[PDB]
Amino acid sequence: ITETKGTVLIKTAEELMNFSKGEENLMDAQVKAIADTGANVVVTGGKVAD
Amino acid sequence: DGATILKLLEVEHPAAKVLCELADLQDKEVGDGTTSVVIIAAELLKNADELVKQKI
Amino acid sequence: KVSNSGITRVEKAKIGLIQFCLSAPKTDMDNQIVVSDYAQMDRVLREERAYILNLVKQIKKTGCNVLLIQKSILRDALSDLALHFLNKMKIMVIKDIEREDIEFICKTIGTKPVAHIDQFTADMLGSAELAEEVNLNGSGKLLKITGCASPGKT
Amino acid sequence: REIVHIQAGQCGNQIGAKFWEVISDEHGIDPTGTYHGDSDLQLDRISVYYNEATGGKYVPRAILVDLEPGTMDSVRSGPFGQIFRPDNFVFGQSGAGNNWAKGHYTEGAELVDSVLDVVRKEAESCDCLQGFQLTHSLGGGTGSGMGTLLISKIREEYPDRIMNTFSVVPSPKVSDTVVEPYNATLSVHQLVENTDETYCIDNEALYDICFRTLKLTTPTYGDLNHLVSATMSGVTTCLRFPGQLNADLRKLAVNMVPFPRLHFFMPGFAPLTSRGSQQYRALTVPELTQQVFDAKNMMAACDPRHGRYLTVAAVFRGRMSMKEVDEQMLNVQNKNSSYFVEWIPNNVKTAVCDIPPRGLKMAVTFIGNSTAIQELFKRISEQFTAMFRRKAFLHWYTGEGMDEMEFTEAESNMNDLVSEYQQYQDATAEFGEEAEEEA
Amino acid sequence: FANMVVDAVLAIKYTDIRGQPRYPVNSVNILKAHGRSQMESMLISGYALNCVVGSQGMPKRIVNAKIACLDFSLQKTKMKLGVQVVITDPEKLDQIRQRESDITKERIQKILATGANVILTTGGIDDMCLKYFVEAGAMAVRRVLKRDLKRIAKASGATILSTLANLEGEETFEAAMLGQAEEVVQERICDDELILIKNTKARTSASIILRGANDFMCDEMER
Amino acid sequence: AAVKTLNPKAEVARAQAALAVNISAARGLQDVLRTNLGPKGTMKMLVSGAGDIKLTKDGNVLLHEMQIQHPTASLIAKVATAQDDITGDGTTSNVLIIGELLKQADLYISEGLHPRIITEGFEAAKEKALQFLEEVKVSREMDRETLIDVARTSLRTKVHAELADVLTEAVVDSILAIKKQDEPIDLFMIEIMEMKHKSETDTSLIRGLVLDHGARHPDMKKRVEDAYILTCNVSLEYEKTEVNSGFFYKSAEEREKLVKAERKFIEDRVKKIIELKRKVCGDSDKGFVVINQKGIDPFSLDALSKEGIVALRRAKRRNMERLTLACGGVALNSFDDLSPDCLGHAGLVYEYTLGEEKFTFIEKCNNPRSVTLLIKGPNKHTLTQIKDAVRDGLRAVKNAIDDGCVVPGAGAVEVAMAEALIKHKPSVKGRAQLGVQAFADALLIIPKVLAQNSGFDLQETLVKIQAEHSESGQLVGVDLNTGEPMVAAEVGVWDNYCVKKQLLHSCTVIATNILLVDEIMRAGMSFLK
Amino acid sequence: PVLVLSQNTKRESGRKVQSGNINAAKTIADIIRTCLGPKSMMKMLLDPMGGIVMTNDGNAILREIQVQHPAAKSMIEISRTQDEEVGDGTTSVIILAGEMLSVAEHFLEQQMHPTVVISAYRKALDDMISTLKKISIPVDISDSDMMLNIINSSITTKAISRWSSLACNIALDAVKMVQFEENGRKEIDIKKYARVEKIPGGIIEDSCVLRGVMINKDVTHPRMRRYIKNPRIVLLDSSLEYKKGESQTDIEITREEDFTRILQMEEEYIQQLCEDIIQLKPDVVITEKGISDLAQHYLMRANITAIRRVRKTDNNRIARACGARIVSRPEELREDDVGTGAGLLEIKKIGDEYFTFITDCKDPKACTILLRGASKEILSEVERNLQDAMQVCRNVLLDPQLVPGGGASEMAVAHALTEKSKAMTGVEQWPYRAVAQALEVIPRTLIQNCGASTIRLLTSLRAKHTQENCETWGVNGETGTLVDMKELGIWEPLAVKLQTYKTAVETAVLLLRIDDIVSGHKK
């Protein structure tokens, strides 16, 4: 997320419904791209998400 | 200044506080003779008291 | 005492009572004015002065000489701009009349409370022969209204 | 981000010594430096106020400055002194004498050159620092004089880092130094144009809460540090623990400070009353929140009923359910809404932390921006003006190398600052002579 | 002292309704300043203010004063508490910030274009606003007591203003609403300074300065 | 007694009591300070409330570190410091004269003499002494060999013999390297750095700079054989708008775009440096070093590390100037005018690690106008002892250069004034001859103390010295290993001229003021509360 | 439970009170009467903060003393009115007040009402003033060698008397320069434009008065020049830094190009400021507030020199010296507000510290006195002495009159009053004579401090003045022999004598009108 304060703004019905689906799809591709190089173990120095 | 002196003193006897505002009123209404009024008032009481001790 | 600076005696006064507020417009809903262009700043200043000016022109139109406001604690009741205009139009202003003696005031002089500018006409005014504030020797200032044309039983 | 804490003078060192003490016992740190906690929630943000040295040791990010070794030796020899960094102790040899001129011109000038080197060495160990914290009192010469000089030097060095401070406000009923008003007026003049905000605390309400409400007919300063150290923890608490919304100190400025010049707050700490009342008062949400708008939990001599609040912020600590907190907050917001804001509705900022401060069942923290603070600054100016007319004790200041014009200069700003707060009330705008003629 | 007292009283004689005269004492300002003997205390035919000019660069004596009395502060303008500023196009920010300092500039030029030399204000004056008085060569004073301003306005014929608006939209400042005095001088009286206004033309006014050995003795003559 | 009837809690000490207190307390400061004079003086130990240890032999350092609470011990201490920050040497001799000067004046006063009579004696003696000193001074060229003697004579009274041999060469060399023509010597350009390792005989001079911090990224090179130096104080740290601002987006995709965009202000600055590095350092043979006065984000470090650009963050303000004159670059605040003409040069850069702390060396500059002194030792108290001795050495050399003259020391000059002041006293009139006689004995405390601390007899030795200089007109001083008369200039003992001129001025003024004090009184408010 | 009327307020009355106040007044005089005359010794005082005040000044002694008695508080207060008014004579005023109050108790014990004494005291004061003006001497201010003797006669009693010949030159040059006629016909000699700077070390013979000012600052960026010959200088008031507004502002940004553009707009705004300053081509820029790092980069490009954070008290002196005036907004910078009256700008090091010099002005109206010496305590006594001299010189320039010193005037006035009292009939005759006889405590104090016979010397001097033309004879304060004041050359301004007599008489009137004391009423 942005280091500066950042809020999500929605003005229509579609944006409210499509926000949650959009976030999950983006996360799937990022992890799959990592696994595409062949990594077997990931080590991080911070918090992990569910 | 008679009014200034009395205003600066601390008094709690109610019979004396009446005189303190007596001099204060003479200041607002006129502005002079604030010492003459206090003397007269205290002399009227003292002289009337001896009349009351006699059965009047 | 009177808020006005200069006027302390009125002859053949026409007295009117007000229960609304002479200030910037204010809605019960939580409102706010948003500015995004530099020309808007000058518009706000001009539009506020016109709104206050409009109110005073209505009051003077009916021949009112003495004005009585009612106390308010949620919004201002008499702004500096409003008091300046009422001075130029020669209107005696008395502010912060209590809410619990409004009945007694209306009874004595026969006025009628008003709550909207659109209902400030010449039929809601009371008449008095003399309105003046008197200055006691040293105790303080006092106000007197004498010579009511339509007297009550008070 | 990274923050640094700096303490100066008598009052500043004492509070800071307790502050680091009421941080180590939460995060699993011990007076030797190791971490002995089993909860990983404590070590996630452990590095915001700490540095890690090789071997698992942790050290605070603190600078201790005083002009006399007596205070610094007390902390060094006393509890937790072995934890601190050895070189961070900076001390003089002669003191300040509480002459604001001595601490602002003569002695502080030759000490900052050495202190400024230390803060650079601490700032070099952080990838990206975010701001500073200063703890000082407005009565002592070093707190006011050297505190003013330090801030001016800091501003020139560091362009846009935030400047948070925790300053105690003098209570003139407790006058102490015969020349108290000279010290207070000048420092506030400099503080107005060089800090984001200041958190004021008076020893009067510090005296009242323990004595009357709780117990201990003779409360010494040692307890007074604990009460303010409780307030130290909370404004700062969110920073060391995670939350659903990342509340950093910078967004505190924008969201709590509508105007860059009216930026003085007074905090609040509810869950502390009589020891019997600590047990028998049913410490539920609405009675605990009821202490926010009380006349007792305040720690400033400013009546709120004769004032109008600008913005409020509420911090909650403890593991509750989400519903009841909002329910009572909804209730309280409209319960006493009559005495609320003039033009800034819905100010309430709600923050919740799962782990409470260690020791008690329940805890919260409150911050409010009042228009009644002018009642405090007015009284300071009135006493100041009465002394300047007589020029009493003026030679001790003018004779040290400072021009007389400064005393008259600082007075103007105080009247200017008071006029600002007065303008936002519209109620204080409400005669002896007989001139009421024609026009 | 009896000659001083009677002259001051006769200098404030007022003519009132039908035939009643009026002598409003306490409309004469009494000032105390230790120093020379009390026999050198002087009566002033005019008025005296316990204030000093705002800035050093400004002049300190005017030989023909056109006095303007004001009741509002002269500082950089600022939108009211109800009005907020939201910016979505960055190019508009620069013009926004100029208008804060430019509205006040235009008000000053309206005041100074009519010939005002001395400005008196109960409110404060920002340091930037003092510069315009410096270049135009005018004298200005800030933080003036209300009761003092009432007497000077009465004596010099000026009119106290709490705003600039007129019976129309725009703001104007005519020349028929200015005071006039024969001289304004800042003097030195025992290590401090004050302001003297001499020979007001609309009416007469007087003030008394008292001198004594010290402050306790000075306070006694005042009472 | 006229002040007790007003404020009974006041403390006073009237006419003869006031003189008794001042004279008896000024002598107290002399009885302990007289063992510091000369290279044979004894080293004291000082311990504060925390338990620290600070060995010292200096005069000014001793004054402020001894537990004393006295009014007349406060006037003397303030003068000693004022003689320290200006001249840099001569604080112990200051106290000895003031105490001895008050003792002699008290000798005649106790017989019933008014103190003002002796005061006029001091002024007449002071004027004559300043005229005698003006003709004894020796003018020379200030070559390197002469400066060695002056520096050695001041470094020998504050460390053991073998160490003063090492520090003398470093102090003389450092002054010469930074010395341009007639332009005055500007200190703050001789960096004093201390490293707590190794024996204390490894104190050396480095013809460049040393910095107390180094590379922070792991993959940065630890040594560079030919470097370009870039000196700038611009910030490569993430920064936010002065006016309040926040990010409003609509979905996950737009959130990423705003994340990447916000680094563009800083990433532009980093690209400017890299573009310059490719140009001047076309091949992978030279080096490039960036010294910044501000912070650097980890993202900025990673970009720089991929190009082999050594970078340091948050250096001190003074080094923004020293590096300019050492390497030869330009200290710039912005990158909108970057050009190859503004880079410096340095022949070797490497990094040293000392346990917890790290150091970086900038060496082999073409023509350095600034150098650094590196202090090494096995203890904290030893490093401070070396540091103070270095300060006095630089001031003594610099004064010998600013002035064109050097005055022989070893106790020779005061004997010469003593001789000339005796032959002038018959000329003056009145009882002021007693004042002149009092001054003449005051100047003889320096030769006495020197002989006394070496283990000789005061009366027998001083008469031997005055036996000479009266039959042979040469300037003769005291020898510290034989007690025999010794020609000061021929051996190599020297003393600054400004030190002696100011020392005579200061001492006479205080003793003049102290003797005229009527009473000591403390009648004001007890404490500032 | 208890009945009270005034609740813990003390009260005293009767002849005890009148004797109580007089005995308190005399005690203060006994403290200070050893500090009068050229043979005066010093006193050292101790303050709550631990400093030492080694001083001879009459006022300085009293302002460090705490006294409860109401009567004593009056004497302390009139000390500082004299200093603020005429700057000299804070000791002779106290000694007179005690003596004029002490020779009054003789009449009180002979059942004499105080109002009879008071009418006699103020009656003698008018003849005191008229007699003083009669024997006044007119002076020609255009004679420099005469003005040096006036200042020398007022500092021969202080510590700088050794360096007197230097001190008179420093005091005279400064006052001769700060003199300023301005709009209208208001002539002033203000003294906030003569700064006194102390620097420990050197020698007292290194003191000098500069044609300009000195500043304890240094150049912000090292590359900026440190030696300029004829600088063109501008004085600012605002800050060269992009600071926030005050109108409740906030920015909402929804595009990639808005965050970077906003940041770039702050650097363009500063470049707008720096370019406008450069338009006037100056060489030195002085400002009250901070200077951003960017602003220095543009300024050093155009070969400018800048100074940060100068006190408002120093700009006003610089503005008067160089000839510039302070401008707050650079958009209104012109050619009439640029100062070209300097002649040098130099930055030196004085003991590990940087100073800034602006000297060799064409016609400065502000000066900065530089002092060097042993330590802070000695220099503190130097400036207190110098201030008296510069206050003495000013009074001569406003009222060019002189009267003989050394006690000659007091005896001349004493003789005139005594010969006039024998034409007076009534009981007021006696107080009218004792007041005149109370003046002779001035020569008597001078004799005792010298170490002479106060009985023999005073009776011979009183007999001397009885003759027709000997009004200028006084007492030499170093040998103890009656000498004429024409040849010795001692004079003091007429203003000093008038204030000493006026203050002394009026204070005695104040304390003679007392009858009782009430205390401890807690506001």
Ligand SMILES: Nc1ncnc2c1ncn2[C@@H]1O[C@H](COP(=O)(O)OP(=O)(O)O)[C@@H](O)[C@H]1O
């Ligand atoms: N080798 C030497 N032989 C004789 N006298 C010496 C020698 N070295 C130094 N001195 C004398 O020691 C005196 C004191 O110098 P020092 O010990 O540094 O203390 P200070 O300089 O403070 O008096 C000088 O006057 C000098 O003449």
Ligand SMILES: Nc1ncnc2c1ncn2[C@@H]1O[C@H](COP(=O)(O)OP(=O)(O)O)[C@@H](O)[C@H]1O
């Ligand atoms: N050389 C002198 N011989 C005799 N009297 C002197 C001499 N110099 C000064 N005086 C006298 O000293 C008196 C007071 O001077 P001073 O000691 O400064 O006290 P103050 O000025 O506080 O009254 C003057 O009245 C003057 O006549």
Ligand SMILES: [Mg+2]
């Ligand atoms: Mg009366």
Ligand SMILES: [Mg+2]
């Ligand atoms: Mg030495």
Ligand SMILES: [Mg+2]
């Ligand atoms: Mg004198």
